[PDB]
Amino acid sequence: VMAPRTVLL
Amino acid sequence: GSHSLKYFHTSVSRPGRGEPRFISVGYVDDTQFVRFDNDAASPRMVPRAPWMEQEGSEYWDRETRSARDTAQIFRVNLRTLRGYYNQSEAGSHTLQWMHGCELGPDGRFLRGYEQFAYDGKDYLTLNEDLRSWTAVDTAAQISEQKSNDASEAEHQRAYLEDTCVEWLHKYLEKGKETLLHLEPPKTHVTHHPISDHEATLRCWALGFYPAEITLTWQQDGEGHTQDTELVETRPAGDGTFQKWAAVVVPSGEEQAYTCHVQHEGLPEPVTLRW
Amino acid sequence: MIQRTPKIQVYSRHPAENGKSNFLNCYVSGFHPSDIEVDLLKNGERIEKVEHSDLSFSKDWSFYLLYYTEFTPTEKDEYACRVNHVTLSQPKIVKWDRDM
């Protein structure tokens, strides 16, 4: 699965 | 063997035509099995392999939200970066993100990684320990502190360390056939003479899978190699790859030369002669 | 802002067999940014109904796509790939040579 949350830059 | 579960995300800003393009393609080494394309006629996460067809709504729904959410954060991200670089909103920009986890030949976690790039360049990288980040710009430093104060590496490490490996497992299972099956290279030499006194010999590897392959043109024993042009391995379009190495020889000497081809689907290395 | 120019490779799925049906491929890679124009050509004319794969990139972040179409090699017919990108003064055309 793709990661549950991504980084907010 | 050794395996990896990896995703590639790309967001491209579209000045005139509003909302940026967001694409997302996942892989179980060398094989694409899902993809999300907010542009596609179906802005949903779809299976790209057939062994993935045997997956229930729950999954596709959930992954579709995941992709949608990232596309949303990526659109906020794209704005923030347009800011850090004091950039006109009328130009296009690309935010890319790649992340993956790997298993040891022994079946468990091995290494996991994560990176961001903006307008083609490295921007922020999750470090080896998977507890820190390395910025590349100063803009990136802001993204770096923001990041640490938020504790993103912690989340990322979990995913990367369990979730990712746990599912890689499940995909290997569901892809038993396809994935664990190697396809060796049909092989052959070809002669194409240049001048009155010399020609090109081209060693060919066709239809192999996975894509790692090795081609070498060595002359009778010493296998020193003379400049050999190797085209970039390529896809045939059917799931298999193609590759070829060429060398220039003086007519008459075409036997002095032998091509060795290496590939997992070969019980052993193969030699070819013209 | 980084830009990388596309590498092009025109080639067929199976070895060229005059009269034997096949698949013509234009493989474009190692470019940045991702906006690219790729046309398959048959004797200078743009082949309609071509297809391409899902945009994806590799480790150094450069993009790659495979463009292709079903076709039938002939000794006479001239095939090519025509590519356009910001890094190119003008489109680049590379001729299919069944030998590659």
Find the Cα–Cα–Cα–Cα dihedral C46, C52, C56, C62, rounded to 10°.
-20
- For residue B106, give the DSSP letter: T
Minimal Cα distance from B246: which residue of C?
C100
- The CATH number of whichever domain residue C25 belongs to comes to 2.60.40.10
Q: Does domain B182-272 have CATH number 2.60.40.10?
A: yes
Q: How far is C85 from chain B (nearest CA, A)?
A: 14
Which of B5, B38, B72, B73 is the best substitution to test chain A (most A C-beta atoms within 10 A)? Answer: B73
End-to-end Cα distance, chain B? 33
- For residue B237, give the DSSP letter: S
Q: What is the spatial distance between Cα B188 and Cα B245, in angstroms, rounded to a whole number?
A: 11
Which helix (H) or strand (E) covers residue B59, if one does? helix B57-84
Question: Which tokens is C46 given?
Answer: 């743009």
Q: How were these coordinates obtained?
A: X-ray
Structural domain count, chain C: 1
Q: What is the secondary structure of B181-198 as a DSSP string?
A: --BPPEEEEEEEEEETTE
Q: Are the beta carbons of C13 and B120 separated by less than 8 Å?
A: no
Q: Which residues contact B105 (CB under 8 A, 6 or more apart)?
A: B1, B2
Reported structure resolution in angstroms: 2.8
Q: Which residues of B touch A6 (CB under 8 A)?
A: 9, 69-70, 73-74, 97
Closest CA to B261 of B191, B201, B188: B188
Minimal Cα distance from B47: which residue of A?
A1
Which helix (H) or strand (E) covers residue B35, if one does? strand B31-37
Closest CA to C10 of C81, C83, C87, C86: C81
Q: What is the spatial distance between Cα A7 and Cα B144, in angstroms, rounded to a whole number?
A: 10
Q: Does domain B2-181 have CATH number 3.40.50.720?
A: no
Its sign, for the CA torsion B101, C1, C3, C56, is: positive
Q: What is the spatial distance between Cα B185 and Cα B263, in angstroms, rounded to a whole number?
A: 8
Asked if B260 and B205 count as a contact pair (C-beta separation under 8 A), the reply is no
Q: What is the spatial distance between Cα C23 and Cα C21, in angstroms, rounded to a whole number?
A: 7
Residue found by looking up tokens 């490779």 in the block: C9
- Domain assignments of chain B as residue spans, ordered by start: 2-181, 182-272
Binding site: residue ranges of B?
7, 63, 66, 77, 84, 143, 146, 156, 159, 171
Q: How far is B83 from chain C (nearest CA, A)?
A: 15
Domain that holds residue C31: 1-100
